[PDB]
């Protein structure tokens, strides 16, 4: 419902994201790895603020289930 996000890294930003619901997360230190994200700030909820998290990335996050997430590789993996 609120989130506040800021420069630092993908990696980082879903990790802070993920303290605020108390969800699950399920990534690697790796594909998060280096990207960076000018971070997000608004009225956002669990979805909308992973849609936005995008900018500045290839990656997708992918909620798992319930209220949780995986993260989904397919930056440039193929365009098929």
């Known amino acids: ?3 506040n996000i800021a420069p630092g890294s993908l990696d980082k930003a879903l990790n802070q994201y993920a303290a605020h619901s108390g969800f699950t997360l399920s990534v690697d230190a790796s594909l998060t790895r280096g990207k960076q994200s000018n ?9 909308s603020g992973l849609q936005q998290l995008l900018d500045g990335s290839g990656l997708q ?5 319930n209220n949780s997430w995986t993260l989904e590789p397919a930056p440039a993996p ?3």
């Open 1 to 3: 419902a609120q989130v």
């Open 78 to 80: 193929k365009e098929d």
């Open 39 to 47: 971070g997000l700030h608004g009225d956002y909820d669990v979805e």
């Open 61 to 65: 996050v992918k909620p798992l289930g």
